[PDB]
Amino acid sequence: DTINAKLQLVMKSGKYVLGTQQALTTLRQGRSKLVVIANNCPPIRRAEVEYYCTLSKTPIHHYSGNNLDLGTACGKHFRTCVLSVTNVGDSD
Amino acid sequence: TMMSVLANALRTIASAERRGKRQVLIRPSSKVVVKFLQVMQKHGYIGEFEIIDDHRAGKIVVNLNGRLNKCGAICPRFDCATTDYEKWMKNILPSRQFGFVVLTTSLGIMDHEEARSRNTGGKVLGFFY
Amino acid sequence: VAPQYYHAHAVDATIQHEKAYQRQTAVNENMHRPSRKHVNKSGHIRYSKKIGLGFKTPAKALNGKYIDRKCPFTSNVVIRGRILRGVVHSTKMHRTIIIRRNYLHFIKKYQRYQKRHKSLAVHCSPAFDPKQGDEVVIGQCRPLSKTIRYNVLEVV
Amino acid sequence: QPHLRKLRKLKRGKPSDLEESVAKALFELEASHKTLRQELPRFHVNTVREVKVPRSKKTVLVVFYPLRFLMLVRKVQRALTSELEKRHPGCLVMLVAQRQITKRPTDVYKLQKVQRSKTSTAVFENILNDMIYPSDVVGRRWRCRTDGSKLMKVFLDARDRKRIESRLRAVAYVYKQLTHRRVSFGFMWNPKLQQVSTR
Amino acid sequence: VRMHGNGRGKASSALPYRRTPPAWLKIASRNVVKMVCKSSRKGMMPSQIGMELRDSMGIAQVKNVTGRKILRILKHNGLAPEIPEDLYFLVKRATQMRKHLERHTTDRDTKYRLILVESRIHRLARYYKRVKQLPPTWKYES
Amino acid sequence: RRLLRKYRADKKIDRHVYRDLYMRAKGNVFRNKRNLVEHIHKIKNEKKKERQLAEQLAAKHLRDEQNRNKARKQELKKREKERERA
RNA sequence: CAUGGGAUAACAAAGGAGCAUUUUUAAAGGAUUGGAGAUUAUGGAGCUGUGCGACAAAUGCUUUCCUCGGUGUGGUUUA
RNA sequence: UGCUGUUGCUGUUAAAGGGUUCGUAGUUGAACUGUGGGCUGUGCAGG
Ligand SMILES: [Mg+2]
Ligand SMILES: [Mg+2]
Ligand SMILES: [Mg+2]
Ligand SMILES: [Mg+2]
Ligand SMILES: [Mg+2]
Ligand SMILES: [Mg+2]
């Protein structure tokens, strides 16, 4: 994936948070540059995150895989529903 | 895979001599191959040869006169004390009158007659006649 | 004039944990030698000797505190006979290691060699810290146990 | 004297005639020339030698400089050698970096540790490259004659012939002087296909 | 080719004998090193970096201009891949094969090819552990 | 477990050691309290040996970096003096 | 068992960014005779840092990011 | 008796290549660090 390469880029060089609460926190400020959501997200939480992104004018990416796939892609050995990139590093 | 560069070179030379060629390309080359070729040259069994540099293991073009009957490598390179020369000549050479067993010794690579003159043993590399 | 050299130190628990008191047999650790025949860097009384054959006594033997009655440098165990080299194979035992002597054995009929190995149990003094794969020089001594006939003399 | 900054501090006390003349020429060039003005203030030489190539005319001025200036000298070698030749009539100038050679160890453990750039083959290759710098070696052969001798032939690009062929004899003799090895030169007009030019 | 199969293909590069860079290449060595590090910082492995420099910038060989190979430059700058590039690609292929086989349990040909890829991964990991290019206890997880 | 908890609270062992010894205690590695304590002491002794070796390594690193900085600074000074000689 | 030889080999190590200039003088600081052992102190040689002179350095600190002279029967080099 | 074969056997059809791969001990494993030079005399040296 393109998203996999960009994600590993930011895992090495940028900054991010994992989990919906920390993502929404970075969203409530302007620190977030991109929100990545697993296809596994429960509908109401997905909708809340989309609303926050729409209000903050933050780009939203819908991951193909579920929270397990997203967690593995981020190098993590746990699942993550929502990722927020707060510093893009040397990616884009 | 290729495991002995010397055996490959000597088999190539023997094939070219058997089929009556006047030149043969050897690939790859090494120092031991060059010393063996020089030993054969010193006794007139091959003519002039050229080492081509390719920034790798090089290549050799050997000019063949019709004098070489057969050259081959001995694998493994068996130990040979000064008292084993007669046995090797009996086993691998056409006669006691001509032909050479080539050895690697701590005095360098040479044929068996020169080594016996220096009173040194070593490992058997091959033969030619 | 002897009681003027008597000096009492305290028992340190890093050594004395055997239910019997650990001490060198060759010296009296309570009395200071007037001539400093057996004294370490820190003034403690410690016996040490030079084994022959040009083997240097390790600094930890001269100046350490370990008690080992089988150490060739600080006890009456002496080195005589064979000096062998080997690779350390196991360090699982207390003060004893297993070494391997790998060698080629020639079969005359086939004019070829065979890989063979022997294993020797060796006493290792606390003056050395050998690891698996290290090279060691060992020297033959009197029997120290059912299998041990050698002592570690140097760790490469 | 201002011009002696262009030598090693060792030779500034009692400079030889040729070393002082080369230092003077380098000092004047460090101001007159525009391309040599950008590099020469950091550059200085070790020694200068005269070599008389036999059976010919003209001598060869061998200028020795520290190896740390290799890139500096490479960057302006074509200008520097031409200007120095314009200074000395009837003499060729060849700039050779001073290189140290680590003799081949007799032990397999020391042999594994020697700096490969301090081996004889690498050093001799680099010295010959210095001698002919603007041209590069296009091929290399060793001719092994029936008498046990080995003769090395170095091939250059035939499009460079009109600039180097006249110097090739002096280069061969000076390479023999410095390395105690023989070298012969040939030209190839199609190096990719090993096409040797007969003239 | 030869390892794991009957392929005998010969296709490869033939590096030039004349190693000196062309005279029309007027990019200094330090600028080339900067380009290499910038490419690595955009998540490019040494193979891809070399290919961009060769296709778009006229740098036939980085080592011939700078004196150093690309992975050496990345190591000197802290940009080298955490695990070696070829092992990374083999692990990625094995993972994709396993993902495909999760749904396609009767694709026996892919199971055969997965066995070959994993044996390759173990032989390479053994090599890289021996030359201290990997940690001990580095484990390939299926 | 009560012993391991008390040792963690008093900082006698760190989290990694606590977790390892906890999983080994559940796995019937220690026969009694004194066995666990002796294993803890052995861990601490090996840790002290490693720490001493690493402290020597760090001292060499500091000394070598200092010598390097001094050599570089002296070379810069001498080059400046040579330039001022011109 | 001792020793000469080093060509062919083996063992071990490394995996090349944990890889790091020779000296001079100066100041600043922290065992030996002495009649011989003892004791008890000076006085040093011998440790870092501050200067200074003299060399070097396998890679440039004067850096790197902020028509004419020479050459073989035209070719370079400035113009 | 080269019908036990290291020297030194046989394996398409006479006896004998495992159905095919993978693979651990084992065995085996590519180049490279390297032409010493001058002086005189002497040799069917040779182009
Ligand atoms: Mg039969
Ligand atoms: Mg059959
Ligand atoms: Mg048959
Ligand atoms: Mg049959
Ligand atoms: Mg079957
Ligand atoms: Mg296999």
Could you characterize what this model shows?
The structure is cut from a larger assembly and holds chains A (92 residues), B (129 residues), C (156 residues), D (199 residues), E (142 residues) and F (86 residues). Chain B is α+β, with helices and mostly antiparallel strands. Chain B folds into two domains: 1-68, Ribosomal Protein S8, Chain: A, domain 1, CATH 3.30.1370; 69-129, Dna Ligase, domain 1 (2-Layer Sandwich). Helix content of chain B is 32%, strand content 27%. Chain C is mostly beta strands. Chain C has one helix at 59-63; strands spanning 83-90, 96-107, 112-123, 135-140, 150-155. The longest helix of chain C has 5 residues, at 59-63. Chain C is elongated. Chain E is mostly helical. In chain E, 55% of the residues lie in helices and 0% in strands. In chain E, helix 5 (85-103) runs antiparallel to helix 6 (108-130). Chain F has 86 residues and is mainly alpha-helical. Chain F is 85% helix and 0% strand. Chain F has three helices and no strands. Chains in contact: A-E, B-D, D-E. Chains B and D meet through helix 2 and strand 2 of B and strand 4 of D. Chain D binds two RNA strands through helix 2, helix 3, strand 3, helix 5 and helix 6. Chain D: One of its GO terms (cellular component) is cytosolic small ribosomal subunit. Chain D: It holds the Pfam family Ribosomal_S7e. Chain D: GO terms for molecular function: structural constituent of ribosome. Chain D: Keywords: Ribonucleoprotein, Ribosomal protein. Chain D: One of its GO terms (biological process) is rRNA processing.
Main features:
part of a larger assembly, 6 chains, A: alpha+beta, 4 helices, globular, B: about 130 residues, Dna Ligase, domain 1, 2 domains, 5-stranded antiparallel β-sheet, 3-stranded antiparallel β-sheet, 8 strands, binds magnesium ion, RNA-binding, ribonucleoprotein (chain A), structural constituent of ribosome (chain A), Ribosomal_eL30-like_sf (chain A), Ribosomal_eL30-like (chain A)
